[PDB]
Amino acid sequence: DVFLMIRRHKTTIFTDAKESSTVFELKRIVEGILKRPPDEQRLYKDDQLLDDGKTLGECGFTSQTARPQAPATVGLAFLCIEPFSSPPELPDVMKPQ
Template sequence: MDVFMMIRRKKTTIFTDAKETTPVHELKRMIEGILKVPPRDQRLYNKDNQLMDDDRTLQDCGITVATAKAQCPAQLGLAIRENSGDFEQLDLTPYSLPPDLPDVMKNQ
């Protein structure tokens, strides 16, 4: 079955889907195709900010059809190795809030 994920890093959000049985390493290869960052330079974190092991499947990491639906995807964090060789701190920039509705559009 397909699971749906939002992979976030700073101001970047990637929406993707995969099978529950997909290994974390394969998900990193999908990210490589988008961001051009090799899997060895990526770290993925689950919703509890725990590092996800490359050899485990998404299902092993708690990403299942029940927890990662299309209308409510699982949120993962992404950190990338910097030029110094160290991984950056996990940084998920909050989404901005929409402005208030103008008075003419509010119910009276």
């Protein structure tokens, strides 16, 4: 199975699309909660466009890459995804002050 996240500049869509399902099923999943047709909006993995008939399995979304612990991230365009507000850094301890 494949667990991945779908983000549109402020959001994050947690899905459970299997390796059999292709981009069209994730488009329907997004439409089920964001009410946007697949013709209007397209997803962007990194900076690359995925074909609708092209299965996500050969798009680099292997099981060992998209485990639910660290799901894969894809950008959604109706990119400029705002960063997650990374937690404050820790002292390196062995760093000489």
